[PDB]
């Protein structure tokens, strides 16, 4: 689940509690709210994306995608020309980049 999912879980269960019939129901809803709150707590909300400094490691991580996008663009130009086979070969070269990042950060 992502932050958005967790908020949906919070909102849904709050409404359940408002319409709740008995203690068991309220307990069940509150328990799920607690877990969702703690999962949401670990996320970076969209409004604070790009507002924090990146570590050297985080900078290198993000740089891997700049490499990948450059290679995707190379393949994309071939696809737009209609060179199916050469676009498929260019895609295969992406795997080098995929693997390099994984080895460091997965």
Q: Which residues are annotated as a binding site?
A: 7, 102
CB of 27: closest distance to Zn ion in angstroms?
22
Angle at the Cα of 42 (from 36 to 44), degrees rounded to 5?
110
Residues in Cβ contact with 10 at an 8 Å cutoff, skipping those fewer than 6 apart: 33, 36, 37, 40
Overall size of the chain counted in residues: 106
96 interface partner picked from a copy of itself, ligand HEC, Zn ion, none, CB below 5 to 8 A per type: none
Is there binding between residue 45 and ligand HEC (CB under 6 A)?
A: yes
Binding positions for ligand HEC, rule: CB under 6 A: 3-4, 7-8, 10-11, 14, 45-46, 61, 64-65, 68, 94, 97-98, 101-102, 105-106
């Amino acid at each position: 689940a992502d932050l958005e999912d967790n908020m949906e879980t919070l909102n849904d269960n709050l409404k359940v509690i408002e319409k709740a019939d008995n203690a068991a129901q309220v307990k069940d809803a509150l328990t799920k709210m607690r877990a969702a709150a703690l999962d949401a707590q670990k996320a970076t909300p969209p409004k604070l994306e790009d507002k924090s400094p990146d570590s050297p490691e985080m900078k290198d991580f993000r740089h891997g995608f700049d490499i990948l996008v450059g290679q995707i663009d190379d393949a994309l130009k071939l696809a737009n020309e209609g060179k199916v086979k050469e676009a498929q070969a260019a895609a295969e070269q992406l795997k080098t980049t995929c693997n390099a990042c994984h080895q460091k950060y997965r």
